[PDB]
Symmetry: D2
Subunit: 326 residues, 4 copies
């Protein structure tokens, strides 16, 4: 049986409330050992070893946890046959993509969470964790990049997103679909991400102490330019626009971002719209402003790629190419 | 045949490019009478009269245009049998819900646009317009609140949202579903929104020249508090959070908003997740902080209602009751 | 606290296997009182009484069980405040719509099941049951027709259908959407079905020991007419076609059904396509052939209504009017 | 510019009605030349050559058109750079999969249709045909198997299905998602089907005059065994069950099919449920009855694979392996 390492970071999977029945809960007070022991059947599928890396709600996820995780997986790759990472729902799609772009271990790296706390009736965490271990133990899971496993489904860390605030079935790859479905501890893989990941990216965080500063600004009717100005005034290295429609910007926000780009701020147009690509050759002449189009990357995922692009270049043309390859 | 009035605002529905094939287009050099003449079959179902209210990309939609529209529809209600409003796709969901809450005419008010340019191969606007007029001429459309008609579907103004950046089928009511489908010029209506709309709301905009200042801030891993601080420093009447998962807030953003809410800024927790309610009784003690949970209202929709709630009250308990009724 | 009656029929919700991990299970060796005792929090919200009506896999659901249930609910209406019916997932959508059309009690009648066995890791049945009882105890659930409660969602009996073979989130109202979502033991109802149900239908099953014989035939490339002929040769009261696209029929099948419809068999065109209406005024001249178009009723739902329409009339014009009202 | 062959078979794309506005139409009276000339911009992207193979509604698609198409593509492969096939919506998913399994040309083979007739307002056919030619001309489209292009999306012929009776956006790969999206005449491919197709299958129809007889029977509550018996009595080589839930059978239908399998009839369990796999190791002991589980193949697609399997073997174990590889 394979050796699988659980790197725990907190999340609702490690959350608890005083009633099985009421919706209230807190995260940060349930250790990895407790999660493992709630899933006795993991003995049938792997030699599990748990480590508590941090214990936080993923609403508080940050750069330094990202760097710690990537360096730890790259470092320990040779000590184990696979990794499972327990994590909150809220920012799972961001951490999964960061790791997709920075892990050099091509052994399976699987993230898992739960929508219901560990204390609740019909808690989803136990079976999700089981299925994440299944996935991490499956030799066929290697070289697919970093994965999220939730609700009996294996998802690639680039396209995966949380689609509903409360539903146990929330995680979906909303543009290109899942990689495989898990039934009875077996996976029929029918897909693999073509975008370059892991050891095929140039991004190397092994010596990085920090990541370039990238912020996100939202567009809507009568949108204030104040948030965009505040990132510019603080000297942000990059800004991602959560645009309206096909990545469009309220006029105010456009002006501030156009001026920013001319001073060397990287500006990436994404979209608040939950599916579909932010394309070139629509209403914004990106070449003219030095903007980059995000493709199918949503604002939070565009931030991830932008920060990593900014560790290699500040040239908008080269940042567009990165957005076309990763 | 019914008298139907078309109020044009702009949008892709009367936007054009150099060729039928390519995606590039600018919006707002096509006139209202022009759009009509293109769909001569409109004469089979209504006597249409067209007025150009403004001619903009809806990415530059703003409070003034909203107020202009609400007042026009309300003043002209007794002069026609129904209204169609042509509008850009980008912020159609915002304008529809604003009008849903402020329009006092209970004659049908139908919004319509297009995802493909006038000039494009297989342009969707002609048939969209036709179906929008079908809907506005149907007696069964009255008293259902402000409607959006796209892709053969009749969608209520509160739940309707754009789900894809380029797809002709983008507009969906993603939480509660459509009201009716249109086929062969008839509608089988099987649903109506329970939330109070139009003449069942206390919002009265007839004598307002401006709306309260409400801004939106985005949450994500390592989120800066600088956007939120910029809004508080400007003395914004309200701030909506596009939270992560079930409306949660990055720690720094939470600190800044906790302060805003006890300092004269109403704070509404919404979510960047495209479906489902931001709920009470989850991880955030709304009462302690003076926060309001948005329910199914997405951030830009939550802004609409918060602006209007602030015309009536600054008390977060009363604002929450508004978010529970409209 | 309200008196709620649970009528058990079987299903996966009280089905079990040898282990929590593996997918294998048989259905119907768990008792009704057993299921209750497993969810002790039921006592916080109702006084529940349980009766075992039958104990079957719902794949063997039949006309007798339907009639038994309708009559029981109708006779016992005045003796409880609401009903929960535990049932297999496989034909839950059929039974719910039959009861939707025949139940005369306008107290809440809620159906519930489970996609995972009793014995499985992260079993969905306990919380499903809890939420089903929440829904049946809610006064706001009355007069909305027969309901199905699954995965925190309240779904009307006409539109609800199972969309996936294994997913806990399978049950969706795929054309008109849900009625309400349940969170923290409360329901925010925002929709109600317009189609006539329960006491607004003329279908009265109190004195029937059998239902008219209605069969379903499938269409596909090179479809044999032999199934359709077998039903006509047996003198079936009706045949539903699971047509291709918008209810179309393979040529041979069309010939056999054209004949059936002028020869004492009612013929309803439905569709194998999982969403959308089978319409009039498309490629098939329904009036010429004596055919009925099913609208959004899928084949198995169309059977339900056709059986009940045939208790009242054999005239295809009257049957079509039924399909337009219920 | 590449040479692209259009093989036309009829369909709604070649359909017409007397009004742009009314839903009525017929197919079989609009030739390929007419479709080509409706899309002048095809000159910018390919040297197009059209041939009318047949001119029928796809509700009448059959084995002999399938064999004619596959043999024609295999024969003419060296005379052209790609193929587009114009076809009705109704059975497109069946023809696409057949060709996916029998074409040995690894040059792009793309199917295309339209939901609205060529005569209607906002007819979808012209732009769909444009995008199908784009796809067929893209070198990157080779070795992805046979494709369907509809509504700006490239779909693999195995998973692709029509999901709505009337919506222009109906075609979706409902289990594993699309391969790429088309914008401005360019395709970003992010996926390829892992299931073996085209020159990687053993199926060779070059010398076949006919295909084994396979029928489909539907399951529902109180299902008659008469259709299953009628296929058995006629000596059908195979039967596919459109099962309930995870491919379950009403007891009557089970008995007839169990007995059939013991006499050498091939029996494949599929599901009427529109997404998800019909799995082994659920409620049916397939090994015991000599049944085969269809996986994610829906009944009509299981028929296609079954007919082709039956040209190689009648052994159920070997037919299961075929269902696990193709």
């Amino acid at each position: 049986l394979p050796n699988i390492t659980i790197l725990a970071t907190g999340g609702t999977i490690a959350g608890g409330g005083d009633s099985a029945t009421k919706s209230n809960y807190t995260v940060g007070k349930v250790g990895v050992e407790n999660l493992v022991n709630a899933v006795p059947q993991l003995k049938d599928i792997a030699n599990v070893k748990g480590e508590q890396v941090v214990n936080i709600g993923s609403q508080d996820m940050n750069d330094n946890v990202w760097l710690t995780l990537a360096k730890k997986i790259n470092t320990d790759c040779d000590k184990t046959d696979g990794f499972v990472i327990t994590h909150g729902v809220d920012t799972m799609e961001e951490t999964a993509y960061f790791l997709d772009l920075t892990v050099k271990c091509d052994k399976p790296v699987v993230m898992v969470g739960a929508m219901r706390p560990s204390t609740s009736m019909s808690a989803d965490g136990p079976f999700n964790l089981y299925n994440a271990v299944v996935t991490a133990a499956d030799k066929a899971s290697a070289n697919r990049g970093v994965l999220v496993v939730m609700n009996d489904t294996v998802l690639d860390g680039r396209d995966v997103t949380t689609t509903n605030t409360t539903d146990v079935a929330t995680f979906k790859s909303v543009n290109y679909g899942p990689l495989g479905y898990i039934h009875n501890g077996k996976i029929d893989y029918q897909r693999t991400p073509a975008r370059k990941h892991t050891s095929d990216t140039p991004f190397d965080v092994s010596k990085l102490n920090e990541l370039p500063k990238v912020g996100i600004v939202y567009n809507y009717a009568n949108a204030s330019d104040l948030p965009a100005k505040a990132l510019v005034d603080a000297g942000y290295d990059g800004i991602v626009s959560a645009g309206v429609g096909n990545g469009n910007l309220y006029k105010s926000v456009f002006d501030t971002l156009a001026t920013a780009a001319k001073t060397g701020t990287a500006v990436v147009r994404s979209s608040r719209v939950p599916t579909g690509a932010t394309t070139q050759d629509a209403e914004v002449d990106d070449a003219k402003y030095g903007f980059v189009a995000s493709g199918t990357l949503n604002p939070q995922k565009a931030r991830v790629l932008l920060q990593l692009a900014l560790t290699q270049t500040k040239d908008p043309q080269q940042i567009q190419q990165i957005f076309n390859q990763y």
